[PDB]
């Protein structure tokens, strides 16, 4: 139950992380109610990447009432607006200090975990998925 | 806080779902405390697939105290035993009625969602990720 608890509002952004190349575009959502983070990696910053990311985030967190983004083309496209409408999720572009903080915490954590494993530059491709998941764990739990 | 709440014990299995081919192996975890489900898809039933799945599940649910599996080779290999030890997760092979139920609920939900989208046989590859995430959402939230 929500009750008087925080409203179910997310902030979402993309942040570029070459340690994760070739899928170096990280799509990042912060649930403003709980501060939980969901991150996925993508080859390209696109509308469909944003949609794939939110599909994952909904699986993890539930369906939000609203999502705040910037006015980037991947978020204001007809395709993305229609996808959010299909899900019944309100969308605003406005401010999103929480997701900016999430981006920095994630990139720092990725670096620390990678260097801990001996990867001082790009993370080997076969190691990225588990390292990204480990960073998400580290920031949420 | 746990308090007197249910112990943090998962059940994990693999179940084959040709609607999701070529990555038709679904790795399924049920959190026995909450009945939450995490599912990932994989090309092959292997030790490393199980590890990749649990990495994701830990990102979503937190680190469990213990995981129950069957005695399949992907779970009793030296590689998997060492991975669980690295994480400090206790492992038992024993019984796992909850994950069997999860498997069936997931496959039924996948079918319903796929047929709703007009896919009466295999789901087109580019549509699978979001459909799988939708099934997971549908069963958890």
Swiss-Prot record, chains A, B:
State the signal peptide span: none
Q: Which residues are involved in binding Mg(2+) 3?
A: 13, 70, 100
The organism's superkingdom is given as Viruses
Give every Integrase catalytic domain span: 2-141
Q: Which residues cross the membrane?
A: none
Q: Which cofactor does it need?
A: Mg(2+); Mn(2+)
- Entry's cofactor comment: Binds 8 Mg(2+) ions per integrase homotetramer. Zn(2+) can also be a cofactor for the nicking activity, but not for the polynucleotidyltransferase activity.
Entry's free-text remark on domains? The core domain contains the D-x(n)-D-x(35)-E motif, named for the phylogenetically conserved glutamic acid and aspartic acid residues and the invariant 35 amino acid spacing between the second and third acidic residues. Each acidic residue of the D,D(35)E motif is independently essential for the 3'-processing and strand transfer activities of purified integrase protein.
Described by its record, this protein's role is as follows: Catalyzes viral DNA integration into the host chromosome, by performing a series of DNA cutting and joining reactions. This recombination event is an essential step in the viral replication cycle. Has a strong preference for using the 3'-OH at the viral DNA end as a nucleophile.
This protein's assembly is summarised as:
Homodimer; further associates as a homooctamer.
Q: Which named protein is this?
A: Integrase
